[PDB]
């Protein structure tokens, strides 16, 4: 196919995502967590309930 | 004015990280590792190229 | 690798608008102002001191 | 009241009003419209 | 979006304290904390239920 | 006549709650703050000490 479809990600996002992998205050799974919770973010931007968003 | 950086991310990649999440065959740690070698390899320019001739 | 946005105040948005009803210059005029809003939007001013470390 | 509304336009979409700003076989007056018409989408998308 | 702006004095006055020794970082992390509050309060004037 | 910086909401959140973690030393928690400072005074896409990118 010639179509594809493409999200963004700020820059303070994707840096703050790269930080969440070595986080040694949480365990990993919380870390894959919260990576999730921001993937999920940008696959729906419009979510507004998540951990930083309060 | 004022101007902001953004990295795009085609869905499938999207897509595969999203599932590296919960693949359980993988460790949690082994997850990480590879999340961050997608994210690293959004960030990291993808071509601006070695001229070999510094070494 | 990266791409970009620019980011418009409200006011900078509003003050183009109102610069395409202003009767008495002609509308080649006001798209010329309007180019010139749209032409600096698109520049950078950066003019902040290099800090290197502190 | 120490925060400020911004609205976000990507490269693409500034570089295409100003290139609306030369099309020179619309009349000034359908240019200068078509440039309202996306400030306004922008303001109230 | 939503920004806040902070003034030149501000942030000089926040650079400045983290660099007071004779403070301890628990004091200049709450003189920094009491400007960054002041910049954020309140977010949005017809919503400022960070001042009771 | 004076000069304003721009800080993103969640960027500026972020810092207000770095000033008390507990999961940081209070010199951790005072360096992250001005690496923060740092990069309002002078952006440098985000970059910060500690990052390995």
Do not use: C, G, V
Request: no cysteine; proline share 6%.
């Amino acid at each position: 196919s010639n179509a594809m479809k493409y999200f963004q990600i700020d820059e303070l996002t994707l840096n703050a995502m790269l930080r969440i992998t070595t986080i040694e205050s949480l365990t990993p799974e919380q870390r894959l967590e919260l990576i999730k919770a921001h993937l999920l973010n940008i696959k729906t931007p419009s979510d507004d309930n998540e951990p930083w968003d309060e």
